[PDB]
């Protein structure tokens, strides 16, 4: 888990992002498209829900995410 | 690869060769005379090389490159 | 093998000057 001296989201594109959401869900996977609203279109999306423990893992794929539902994004490592 | 390109010669050397082949009565011209009879089957090509490089009416005289045989047999423009 | 000063004092010995100076050494 490393990073360079990055400035903004566009230079770190396609990376393995962890995405924190308002509904207690963590989306892990790569990126393909962003917007002004931080609307990430995640490449290989895996959804992580915690029912009250056990991480409910879900395969999604290519998902357009609406940005208001997002809390914050984490950069993990290189792609490929 | 060894190739030094073709030697540009003075025009006076060519002109002296053509002037020395006006007598053509010594024995020394014998192989040179052989060259003259061999140069007829390369003569008419040179005629085309004149008449391609024929000087046009807007120019006075067109200083042209030309190959000359050592014996001055044939003069290919 | 000759030294450079010997080449200097031998290239004066050719009678003419230039490349057409004669090495024939008559006198």
């Amino acid at each position: 888990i490393q990073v360079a001296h990055s400035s903004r989201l566009a230079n770190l594109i396609d990376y393995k992002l962890r995405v924190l959401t308002q509904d207690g869900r963590v989306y892990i996977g790569q990126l393909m498209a962003f917007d002004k609203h931080m609307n990430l279109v995640l490449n290989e999306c895996i959804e992580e829900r915690v029912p009250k423990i056990k991480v409910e893992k879900r395969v999604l794929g290519l998902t357009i995410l609406r940005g208001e539902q997002i809390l914050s994004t984490v950069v993990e490592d290189k792609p490929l | 690869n060894l190739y030094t390109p073709k030697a540009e010669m003075p025009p006076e050397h060519l002109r002296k060769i053509i002037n020395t082949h006006s007598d053509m009565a010594s024995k020394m011209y014998n192989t040179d005379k052989k060259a003259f009879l061999g140069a007829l089957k390369y003569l008419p090509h040179a005629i085309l090389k004149l008449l391609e490089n024929m000087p046009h009416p807007w120019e006075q005289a067109k200083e042209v490159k030309v190959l000359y045989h050592t014996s001055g047999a044939i003069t290919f423009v | 093998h000759f030294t450079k000063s010997e080449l200097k004092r031998r290239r004066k010995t050719r009678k003419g000057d230039g490349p057409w100076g004669s090495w024939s050494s008559s006198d």
Binding site: - | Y3, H13, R15 | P19, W20
Partner: protein
């Protein structure tokens, strides 16, 4: 040389100062163009060696005034190059290292000799005397064939 036409420029200033030397070379070429009696073959080739000598000395004179003595400007030298008073290639070989003194362009080409080597006039005279001493005879070379230079390497 080349004829004086309308498309040819007039000469830059300083050319009338060097006109007597080039005119002497010109009138000696005018004399040497005419056929002599010239019956022999060993003395037929000498009257080509005189013309190669005159052309060499004219180009050597222009080279000497431009590169060596620095009297002729670049404009007048380029005009003497356009009007074919001196070859670009002979002066260019004279600019090189090792070909400072040189007979002519024909005697450095390895393409025209039967052995794929240069001419014998590019061998120094001292090297010919060393091989004459190692064989025992005299130096069996006197006058080169393409041009009449006895020895024209940069040392001798």
């Amino acid at each position: 040389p080349r004829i004086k036409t309308r498309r040819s420029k007039p000469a830059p200033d300083g050319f009338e100062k060097i006109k007597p030397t080039l005119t002497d070379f010109e009138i000696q070429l005018r004399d040497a163009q005419k056929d002599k009696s010239s019956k022999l073959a060993a003395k037929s080739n000498e009257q080509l060696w005189e013309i190669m000598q005159l052309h060499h000395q004219r180009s050597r004179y222009i080279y000497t005034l431009y590169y060596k003595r620095k009297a002729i400007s670049k404009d007048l030298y380029d005009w003497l190059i356009k009007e074919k008073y001196a070859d670009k290639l002979l002066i260019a070989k004279w600019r090189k290292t090792g070909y400072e003194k040189l007979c002519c362009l024909r005697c450095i080409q390895k393409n025209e000799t039967n052995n794929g080597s240069t001419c014998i006039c590019r061998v120094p005279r001292a090297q010919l005397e060393e091989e004459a001493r190692k064989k025992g005879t005299q130096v069996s070379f006197h006058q080169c064939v393409h041009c009449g230079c006895r020895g024209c390497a940069s040392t001798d």
